[PDB]
Ligand binder design. Structure first.
Ligand SMILES: *Cc1cc2c(cc1C)nc1c(=O)[nH]c(=O)nc-1n2C[C@H](O)[C@H](O)[C@H](O)COP(=O)(O)OP(=O)(O)OC[C@H]1O[C@@H](n2cnc3c(N)ncnc32)[C@H](O)[C@@H]1O
Ligand SMILES: C/C=C/CC/C=C/CC/C=C/CCCCCCC(=O)OC[C@H](COP(=O)(O)OCCN)OC(=O)CCCCCCC/C=C/C/C=C/CCC
Ligand code: HEM
Ligand code: SF4
Ligand code: F3S
Ligand code: FES
Lengths: 613, 138, 239, 102
């Protein structure tokens, strides 16, 4: 009803998100001459990327000599061969240019004796295609590189006539016969509802780590764009692939950077024995995030846990020089003292694996375009793009590399812009939605605003969070996942018993957090059903009933005299997850991963192998 | 949208709104640096008021300075009561003087950390009391 | 059990005839994270979900949760609750701001001021950008330390009485420090003109070195010291 | 363009240090030239000081212009009055002196 005033807007392009991904897309579209809106539920600078610390990968070769193709090999390997190689070529080749793009904007990178950008070692990175030892290509601004990445882009963004909708909350896509026409949004300030319409729509809403009880991510990481793609009956991809960062702080779960381990910091069990020497003799505590995280967890279950409760590990830095901790790691020094009372220079940080990054999300081309799945084949969704943690081009595959998401952001925000600037022209027929479009998003809004049920928003949130934490952690088993599943499906049913207290139009955060819950649940459902269906161990998804990496071949031996497994008989394939919103039923399907690169001649396909560090 | 337009719209929305101002002086923690800036204002104001009273009376009032002194002498010059007027005349002077130097050192770029602020502050107070007792004694 | 009292600034723009009052809550610190935001989130989640405030990061880099806690402006996620039970936590929104709805203050003007000083690298010849990395010595880089770390949380400006009285025309410590941040960044070419943007009685010169700003900054920064450094550049630049 | 506000600011500090130089010098060497300098500096420093106070607290177009004028009048009068006092009376230094051996 028109209790809610509808206000119609008309743009060439909309970007939903104002993190690095969001910003780079927004002002990239404007630079290209497109009259561009940007919808964000937070003042741009508040977005999660400020929290980023360790750095941004790029083979500038500032410390030693490097090759982007080396970064390529590292990433596909990192991804455990669930990584779409075409997107990983595009990204790694672009990587130097994207980081020079930032520094030339004014990013205050830490420096070397040469005056070039300082880069450091990071988890999972090598020279000469895995054979040449440790690589140093993580570009950084001390251990606060996300903060200044975001503020420099934000700074830049002010040079263009991009229309910003600050503290507006996107509810759904404006969808018409499979084509995306824009977004419908609640203006938090005055409760008003706004249809922003455009030829092209970019979703850059980041991840959904808040599905968990313990996560390094912000309170605002509630998978809201992932949620929107879903209610449009579009698939999400690889949602069960949830990265646990090895070194989250014991108390408040706040991130302590991989940079620590990259700068010489050590992981230690209660015996004092540097245990990563045991699990990965070559890479040690500079191995993959899925492996290090998995090795940490196993040291706990086996009684080598630290502290009174025996439930954590130790990140020793105190052996490094104070002046190195001061210059390289002033941020973590600060927050380890604030949250744990720990002096990094005297005592070790208490650390524990904690949910960090969603490598799953909205499937796309390497060009940024959202894919749907028709008759087991890829189909580009007209007018819909996605980038950053929200998306899934699967450049990260089964396990993200450290300092690759900040890269992901700047490369694919740029890509969505170019794809638009190359496929149409500013001023073109902005397609017209029905006068009654986005009707149901309002009805939903109204039912949630006046909700007088049995269960408060926050109580159902914690229910979901602790259920996801106990049933979909580091290691999972069939039975635990199964109990986990119906438990989440029960909680989806419990949504109809929701209670809201706030009746106001202005800043009804009670209400937005409820819309957020609706979003978190759809991300939860898909993460858990998809997880229970995948009967293998690959990357972050470790099954204790299926320890094997199940490919088309047994890739340990040469593949010659061997039968290639049919598509529906193996697991080297992306999960495509759907949900019927009316009953919360999860349907699931699969598409192949892209193995060929953009050019074999310039960048050779790395076939699957037994992957260890 | 320009920075200027954003400023126009901010003020247009808020002035024509039912929105309240968030409490400020009524709620902010009193600190010595702050009190000392306020008194620098106040002392500065009291002094100009004095200097103006003095020049204006040289223009608007009859007789010479000597004559108005004899008027003060005929009030009957209380010993410590005269020291009191002297003190209360030179106390604002010295305060503003010393704190004024401290201001100049700030303009140079020095003493601008919270430790230096509390120390130099205390010092100014101590110099004020001592030069105020000494000057009234002369 | 350990019961701590909280008194928080209230106002509802949607309730007719409501004025700014103080609502009191009570939180068992046994069952609560050690920080003020933990408390805020806890009362919101368990006692009253009308309590409206900004938050995101939980670790103090986003700058969302800035507010006047017990006299001073800081971030609620970074300041510990006073374990002293004989004291009641008085919580208010940032000083001298239009309250949209309790604790949530209109920062449009704040952000607009930031925009007004062009906080980005400016080059005379912009035609080579994106091609090669600009060189900057380790020494030249250091000059940015204690300046780039700003969160745009607004604690400082919102504490400057000069910003209270003169919020319209006076840019304030947060913004001024960022002007300076760009002024001494050796890669920037527009120092002389960034200075000239301040040549009026208001934008900068409403600072009388009061120093609430530096004294209150949740991040250990020194806006006042930087204003000083600006003022000496203004007095000394040539043209 | 014009770099006026920075000049005014600097000017202020110049007379500030000047006023601070004068006070001890006036004590040690009390003459007439020291009486006028003190009058000049005292009222000029004073004039610019209230200037700042006015510009801080007096909000509005024609209402500030007015104070700025009221203060202008006040200063000129203050300065003349002291100048008169120096020429046709005892003089600042000697007045302070008389006042003090009391
Ligand atoms: C948690 C974390 C992650 C992290 C890191 C440190 C921490 C503590 N350090 C990293 C690093 O050093 N190097 C690196 O490569 N990655 C690092 N990460 C991961 C990384 O930060 C994230 O993957 C990445 O920043 C995600 O950024 P993205 O731009 O894609 O998304 P976002 O920054 O989280 O912000 C989301 C934006 O979307 C808007 N939004 C969300 N929902 C809505 C709705 N409902 N309506 C309108 N707008 C919405 C938000 O406003 C925000 O702008
Ligand atoms: C407008 C001014 C209005 C006049 C009233 C304000 C008087 C207060 C000034 C306080 C200064 C303390 C000086 C004490 C003193 O007696 O000096 C010695 C004087 C005695 O002789 P002697 O040579 O010591 O001989 C005595 C025997 N030993 O020696 C001097 O010659 C005095 C010179 C000092 C100049 C300072 C004047 C600055 C005015 C400040 C305005 C503040 C307004 C309130
Ligand atoms: C020689 C000793 C003195 C010194 C070193 C001095 C210095 C200063 C300085 C540096 C300021 C600037 C304050 C700021 O930045 O906010 C100031 C303010 C001021 N001064 Fe003085 N001064 C002295 C004596 C006097 C006297 C005798 C008077 C009056 C007759 C006076 C009148 C004022 C006024 C009215 C202000 C403005 C108050 C404010 O803006 O906060 N000063 N003084
Ligand atoms: S200088 Fe400090 S108080 Fe001011 S906005 Fe920056 S972080 Fe906040
Ligand atoms: S509180 Fe202030 S008046 Fe200047 S020194 Fe800081 S901005
Ligand atoms: S919420 Fe990020 S600063 Fe407190």
């Amino acid at each position: 009803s028109t209790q809610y005033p509808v206000v119609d807007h008309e743009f060439d392009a909309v970007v939903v998100g104002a993190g690095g991904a969001g910003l780079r897309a927004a002002f990239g579209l404007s630079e290209a001459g497109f009259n561009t809106a940007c919808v964000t539920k937070l003042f741009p600078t508040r977005s999660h990327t400020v929290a980023a610390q360790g750095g941004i990968n790029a083979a500038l070769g500032n410390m030693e000599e490097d090759n982007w193709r080396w970064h390529f090999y590292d990433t596909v390997k990192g991804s455990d061969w669930l990584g779409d190689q075409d997107a990983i070529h595009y990204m790694t080749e672009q990587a130097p240019a994207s980081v020079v793009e930032l520094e030339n904007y004014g990013m205050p990178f830490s420096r070397t004796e040469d005056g070039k950008i300082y880069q450091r070692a990071f988890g999972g990175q090598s020279l000469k295609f895995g054979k040449g030892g440790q690589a140093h290509r993580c570009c950084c601004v001390a251990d606060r590189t996300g903060h200044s990445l975001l503020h420099t882009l934000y700074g830049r963004s002010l040079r263009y006539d991009t229309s910003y909708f600050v503290e507006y909350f996107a509810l759904d896509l404006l969808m018409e016969n499979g084509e995306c026409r824009g977004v419908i949004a609640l203006c938090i300030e005055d409760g008003s509802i706004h249809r922003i319409r455009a030829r092209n729509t970019v979703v850059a809403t980041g991840g959904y780590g808040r599905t968990y009880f313990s996560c390094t991510s912000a309170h605002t990481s509630t998978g809201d764009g992932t949620a929107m793609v879903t209610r449009a009956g579009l698939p999400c991809q690889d949602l069960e692939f949830v990265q646990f960062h090895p070194t989250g702080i014991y108390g408040a779960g706040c991130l302590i950077t991989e940079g620590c381990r990259g700068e010489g910091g050590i992981l230690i069990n209660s015996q004092g024995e540097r245990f990563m020497e045991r699990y990965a003799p070559v890479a040690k505590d500079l191995a993959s995030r899925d492996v290090v995280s998995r090795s940490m967890t196993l040291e706990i279950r086996e009684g080598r846990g630290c502290g009174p409760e025996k439930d954590h590990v130790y990140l020793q830095l105190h052996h490094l020089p104070p002046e190195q901790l001061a210059v390289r790691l002033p941020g973590i020094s600060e927050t380890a003292m604030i949250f744990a009372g720990v002096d990094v220079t005297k005592e070790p940080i208490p650390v524990l694996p904690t949910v960090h990054y969603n490598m799953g999300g909205i499937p796309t081309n390497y060009k940024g375009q959202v894919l749907r799945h028709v008759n087991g084949q890829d189909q580009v969704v007209p007018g819909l793009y996605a980038c950053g943690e929200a998306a899934c081009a699967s450049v990260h595959g089964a396990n993200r590399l450290g300092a690759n998401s900040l890269l992901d952001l700047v490369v694919f925000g740029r890509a969505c812009a170019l794809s638009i600037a190359e496929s149409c022209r500013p001023g073109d027929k902005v397609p017209s939605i029905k006068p009654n479009a986005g009707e149901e998003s309002v009805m939903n809004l109204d039912k949630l605003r006046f909700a007088n049920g049995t269960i408060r928003t926050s109580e159902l949130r914690l229910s979901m969070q602790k259920s996801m934490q106990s049933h979909a952690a580091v290691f999972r088993v069939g039975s635990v996942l199964q109990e986990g599943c119906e438990k989440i499906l029960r909680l989806y049913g419990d949504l109809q018993h929701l209670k809201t207290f706030d009746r106001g139009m202005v800043w009804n955060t009670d209400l937005v957090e409820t819309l957020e819950l609706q979003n978190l649940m759809l991300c939860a459902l898909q993460t858990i059903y998809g997880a229970e269906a995948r009967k293998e161990s690959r990357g972050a998804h470790a099954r204790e009933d299926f320890k094997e990496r199940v490919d088309e071949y047994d890739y340990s031996k040469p593949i010659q005299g061997q039968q290639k497994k049919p598509f529906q008989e193996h697991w080297r394939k992306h999960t495509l997850s759907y949900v019927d919103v009316k009953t919360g039923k999860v349907s699931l399907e699969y598409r192949p991963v892209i193995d060929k690169t953009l050019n074999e001649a310039d960048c050779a396909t790395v076939p699957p192998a037994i992957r260890s560090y | 949208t320009t920075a200027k337009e954003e400023m126009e719209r901010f003020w247009n929305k808020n002035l024509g709104s039912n929105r309240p101002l968030s409490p400020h002086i009524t709620i902010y923690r009193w600190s010595l640096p702050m009190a000392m800036s306020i008194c620098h204002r106040g002392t500065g104001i009291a002094l100009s008021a004095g200097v103006s009273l003095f020049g204006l009376s040289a223009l608007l009032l009859p007789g010479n300075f000597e004559s108005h002194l004899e008027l003060v002498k005929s009030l009957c010059l209380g010993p410590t009561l005269i020291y009191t007027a002297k003190f209360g005349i030179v106390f604002p002077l010295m305060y503003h003087t010393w704190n004024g130097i401290r201001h100049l050192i700030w303009d140079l770029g020095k003493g601008l950390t919270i430790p230096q602020l509390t120390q130099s502050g205390v010092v100014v107070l101590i110099l004020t009391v001592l030069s105020s007792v000494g000057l009234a004694a002369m | 059990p350990r019961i701590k009292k909280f008194a928080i600034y209230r106002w509802d723009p949607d309730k007719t005839g409501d004025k700014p009052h103080m609502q009191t809550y009570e939180i068992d610190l046994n069952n609560c994270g050690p920080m003020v935001l933990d408390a805020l989130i806890k009362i919101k989640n368990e006692i009253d979900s009308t309590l409206t405030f900004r938050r995101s990061c939980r670790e103090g880099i986003c700058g969302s949760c800035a507010m006047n806690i017990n006299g001073g402006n800081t971030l609620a996620c970074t300041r510990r609750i006073d374990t002293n039970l004989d004291k009641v936590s008085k919580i208010y929104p940032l000083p001298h701001m239009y309250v949209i709805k309790d604790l949530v203050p209109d920062l449009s003007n704040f952000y607009a001021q930031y925009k007004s000083i062009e906080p980005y690298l400016k080059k005379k010849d912009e035609s080579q950008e994106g091609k090669q990395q600009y060189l900057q010595s380790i020494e030249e880089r250091e000059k940015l330390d204690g300046l780039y770390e700003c969160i745009l949380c607004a604690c400082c400006s919102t504490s400057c009485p000069s910003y209270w009285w003169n919020g319209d025309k006076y840019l304030g410590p947060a913004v001024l420090m960022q002007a300076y941040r760009w002024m001494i960044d050796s890669r920037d070419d527009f120092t002389e003109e960034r200075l000239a943007k301040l040549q009026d009685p208001f934008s900068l010169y409403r600072c009388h070195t009061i120093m609430n700003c530096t004294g209150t900054c949740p991040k250990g920064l020194n806006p006042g010291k930087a204003i000083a450094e600006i003022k000496k550049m203004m007095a000394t630049y040539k043209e | 363009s014009s770099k006026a506000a920075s000049l005014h600011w600097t000017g202020e500090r110049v007379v500030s240090v000047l006023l601070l130089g004068l006070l001890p010098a006036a004590y040690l060497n009390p003459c007439s030239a020291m009486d006028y300098s003190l009058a000049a500096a005292l009222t000029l420093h004073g004039h610019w000081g209230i200037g700042q106070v006015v510009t801080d607290y007096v909000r509005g177009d024609a209402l500030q212009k007015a104070a700025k004028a009221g203060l202008l009048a006040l200063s000129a009068f203050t300065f003349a009055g002291l100048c008169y006092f120096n020429y046709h009376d005892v003089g600042i230094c000697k007045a302070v002196a008389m006042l003090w051996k009391l």
